């Protein structure tokens, strides 16, 4: 559901008469998203546990299961329902297969 | 079981009961106000004939309580 929201803006921004310094600054930020997203996983979740307190209880409640699992439908099918049903105006994807189109996906990988 | 944190409550809950008891006491003419539109006719748009200009109500449209 990232390509159906984030990537459509980046591809459209490159084909414009607008400011060049503003365009270059957005490209660094798109690659900057990967740092703090992994700073939730690698820094706290992943690796050896830090052990916050001696004897700490953590258990799944019946109210928790009904909330998170039904949020997964909204976080996965968002690029199927919202993007397809809504009528758009003017298609942006046409020019630069490596400079504009690939740059949105390569920034997340690099 | 625990004794827990205590508030006044008795003075607080009584005021809301004493307020609503006098809303409900004058909530009857509110209920009649609905039936005044239901039972009695409100108003109809019609051209006036030269006979009487004002009788009881001079010029009032919508709701019988206005007249």
């Amino acid at each position: 559901t990232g390509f159906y929201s984030k990537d459509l803006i980046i591809e459209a921004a490159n084909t414009s008469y607008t400011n060049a310094w503003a365009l270059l600054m957005t490209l660094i930020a798109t690659s900057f998203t990967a740092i703090y997203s992994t700073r939730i996983i690698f820094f706290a979740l992943l690796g050896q546990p830090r052990f916050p307190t001696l004897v700490n209880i953590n258990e799944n409640n019946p109210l928790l299961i009904n909330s998170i699992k039904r949020l997964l439908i909204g976080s996965l099918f968002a690029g199927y329902i919202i993007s397809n049903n809504i009528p758009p105006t003017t298609i942006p994807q046409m020019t630069m297969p490596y400079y504009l189109k690939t740059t949105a996906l390569i920034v997340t990988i690099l | 079981r625990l004794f827990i944190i205590k508030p006044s409550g008795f003075y607080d809950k009584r005021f809301l009961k004493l307020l609503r008891f006098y809303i409900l006491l004058t909530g009857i003419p509110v209920a009649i106000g609905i039936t005044l539109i239901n039972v009695x006719x409100x108003x109809x748009x019609x051209x006036x004939x030269x006979x009487x200009x004002x009788x009881x109500x001079x010029x009032x449209x919508x709701x019988x309580x206005x007249x």
């Binding site: 049903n85 809504i86 | 809301l16 009961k17 609503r20």
Partner: protein
Amino acid sequence: NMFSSLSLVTLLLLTMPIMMMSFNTYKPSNYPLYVKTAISYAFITSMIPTMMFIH
């Protein structure tokens, strides 16, 4: 005609706990569950006019 009528239902459903907030009827421990049940049916009533908008 159904589009205009069903649109106000979503507005009224959210105000119904506020209408029952001022004493009205006694609800012990059920008031947090009453908010959950009010918005649950508010989603279904909002899904239909969006499906009408695609059509």
